[PDB]
Amino acid sequence: GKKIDFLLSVVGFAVDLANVWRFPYLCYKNGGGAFLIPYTLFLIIAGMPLFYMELALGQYNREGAATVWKICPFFKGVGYAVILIALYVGFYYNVIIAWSLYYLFSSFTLNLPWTDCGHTWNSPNCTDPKLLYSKYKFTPAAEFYERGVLHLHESSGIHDIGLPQWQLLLCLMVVVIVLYFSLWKGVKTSGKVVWITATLPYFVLFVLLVHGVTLPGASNGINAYLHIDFYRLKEATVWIDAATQIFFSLGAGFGVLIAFASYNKFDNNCYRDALLTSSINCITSFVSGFAIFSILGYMAHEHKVNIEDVATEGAGLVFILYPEAISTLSGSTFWAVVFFVMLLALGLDSSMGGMEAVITGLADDFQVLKRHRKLFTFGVTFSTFLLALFCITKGGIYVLTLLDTFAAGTSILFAVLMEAIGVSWFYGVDRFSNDIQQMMGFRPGLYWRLCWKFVSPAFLLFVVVVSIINFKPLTYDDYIFPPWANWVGWGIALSSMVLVPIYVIYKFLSTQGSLWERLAYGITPENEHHLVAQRDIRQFQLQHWLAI
Ligand SMILES: O=C(C[n+]1ccc2ccccc2c1)c1ccccc1
Ligand SMILES: [Cl-]
Numbered sequence: 001g002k003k004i005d006f007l008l009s010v011v012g013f014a015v016d017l018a019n020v021w022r023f024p025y026l027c028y029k030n031g032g033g034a035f036l037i038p039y040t041l042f043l044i045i046a047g048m049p050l051f052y053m054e055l056a057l058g059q060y061n062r063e064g065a066a067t068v069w070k071i072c073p074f075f076k077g078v079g080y081a082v083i084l085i086a087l088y089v090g091f092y093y094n095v096i097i098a099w100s101l102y103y104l105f106s107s108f109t110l111n112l113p114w115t116d117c118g119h120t121w122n123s124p125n126c127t128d129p130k131l132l133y134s135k136y137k138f139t140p141a142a143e144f145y146e147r148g149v150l151h152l153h154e155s156s157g158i159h160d161i162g163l164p165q166w167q168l169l170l171c172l173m174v175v176v177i178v179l180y181f182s183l184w185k186g187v188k189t190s191g192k193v194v195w196i197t198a199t200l201p202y203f204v205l206f207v208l209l210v211h212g213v214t215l216p217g218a219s220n221g222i223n224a225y226l227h228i229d230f231y232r233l234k235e236a237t238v239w240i241d242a243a244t245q246i247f248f249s250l251g252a253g254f255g256v257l258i259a260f261a262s263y264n265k266f267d268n269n270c271y272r273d274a275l276l277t278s279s280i281n282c283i284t285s286f287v288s289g290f291a292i293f294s295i296l297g298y299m300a301h302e303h304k305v306n307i308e309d310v311a312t313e314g315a316g317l318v319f320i321l322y323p324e325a326i327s328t329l330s331g332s333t334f335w336a337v338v339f340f341v342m343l344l345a346l347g348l349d350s351s352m353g354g355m356e357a358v359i360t361g362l363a364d365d366f367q368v369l370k371r372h373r374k375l376f377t378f379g380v381t382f383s384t385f386l387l388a389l390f391c392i393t394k395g396g397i398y399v400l401t402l403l404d405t406f407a408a409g410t411s412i413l414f415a416v417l418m419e420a421i422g423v424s425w426f427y428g429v430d431r432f433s434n435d436i437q438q439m440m441g442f443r444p445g446l447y448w449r450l451c452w453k454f455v456s457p458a459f460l461l462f463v464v465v466v467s468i469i470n471f472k473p474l475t476y477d478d479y480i481f482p483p484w485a486n487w488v489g490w491g492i493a494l495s496s497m498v499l500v501p502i503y504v505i506y507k508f509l510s511t512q513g514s515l516w517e518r519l520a521y522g523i524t525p526e527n528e529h530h531l532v533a534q535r536d537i538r539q540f541q542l543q544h545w546l547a548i
Pocket of ligand 2: 018019023245246249285
């Protein structure tokens with residue numbers, strides 16, 4: 001039974017709410033098949049090596065995101081930046097969980113609310129196929145999502161967001177309460193409910209893939225998926241999206257892996273962990289795009305619109321697609337309950353780790369917070385609840401879009417780039433390899449060291465530069481955000497990107513001694529500062545820098 005338990009642990013570790021909710025609309029937006037060449041390339045080249053590096057860092061140092069930089073004291077700012085990014089994401093992550101819970105509540109009926117026209121939320125333009133370049137939004141399912149759930153029709157833009165929706169308010173309160181009462185005792189929340197939180201996503205994917213293929217218009221969707229538009233690969237938006245999605249789904253750049261692995265057995269094998277997680281992620285993504293495009297090809301056939309106009313490209317694509325596939329199944333109520341229970345469980349499970357990253361990273365930094373976990377968890381959870389309250393208004397989809405685009409984009413890419421720099425170049429890839437050898441019994445191979453030192457930082461810097469210089473103003477499918485919205489988003493990105501130089505400056509000024517002594521204290525591990533008085537700093541020799 002241990003092998004069954006081991007398989008469940010690995011397979012449930014590999015799946016995340018990002019894979020299920022954020023990949024579909026990123027694949028639809030960037031053409032489908034053309035989105036997986038950058039996706040797989042960046043996976044192989046930067047996602048697997050960096051996942052491995054973060055796992056090994058956390059496991060060896062037994063420290064959270066912030067304090068793990070005792071190995072090079074100038075990068076505690078990088079730690080703080082990743083904690084801030086993880087805090088920012090939860091604001092709207094919990095809002096998606098609230099949407100899932102509202103849909104689950106709506107699903108306990110024999111006449112599902114998203115199948116036909118004529119409800120209190122329907123407009124005069126509602127078009128049911130059964131009875132009877134701009135995106136198509138007059139379908140029963142899209143109108144349900146945008147009028148009976150979001151109540152978006154009561155907003156004009158990000159300048160008139162409105163007041164909180166009380167239904168989503170109650171759902172968000174339930175979600176927040178569950179998260180707190182799951183996080184207030186301790187970190188350990190594995191092996192107790194993962195039997196359903198690990199197998200249900202894959203069962204849902206399997207039934208969706210087997211069914212959608214047998215739909216009237218699925219062939220056209222699969223063709224649009226498998227036809228690769230090589231012109232999209234010269235635009236840099238697909239590359240930016242693929243990089244950000246790799247880091248979103250693998251957990252890198254959020255401080256989640258470091259905090260999670262600080263609890264692993266010292267001898268735990270991180271090589272196999274990275275290999276298995278990345279392989280499962282790649283196969284799952286390539287198989288999930290198939291089902292997405294089969295569903296929306298059938299939607300194109302049924303609604304008689306072009307496959308590039310059937311559905312939104314925003315955060316609600318899954319909530320538009322899953323209902324459409326559900327209504328085509330027999331016993332649609334049972335299937336709706338299964339799908340939305342899966343979504344709710346997966347979202348709660350992943351948001352728990354996202355919040356535990358913040359709690360652990362900041363508690364390992366201050367002992368007062370480590371002795372008072374109940375109050376700290378309350379504070380984190382309540383601040384998240386309010387700043388998400390901002391996202392459940394009438395025009396809260398615009399704020400969720402602004403956050404989704406700016407909270408972890410260039411900011412997360414920069415943070416992970418600085419992590420790779422600080423470890424590989426300053427701490428030493430050779431010392432990092434020695435630590436991995438002491439932990440796991442074998443030294444990392446040449447491919448891993450090359451990716452850690454040269455290849456991954458090079459591509460991360462390329463993507464960061466391109467994202468900064470090739471930046472498209474913000475939109476939601478028909479709506480052009482006012483310029484001050486992009487300025488606000490760039491301020492949000494800089495708010496976490498800038499913690500690095502500020503901490504470097506603070507550390508330099510707070511230290512005592514001469515310039516060279518200050519640099520030596522700044523780039524030397526905290527438990528080797530007594531060598532500085534001996535004027536033996538390895539970073540001050542060319543040999544340390546020419547290593548591989
Ligand atoms: O990234 C996450 C949750 N997450 C995603 C992917 C993972 C992969 C492996 C291990 C843990 C993981 C956790 C998050 C959630 C809410 C706020 C901020 C960050
Ligand atoms: Cl993904």
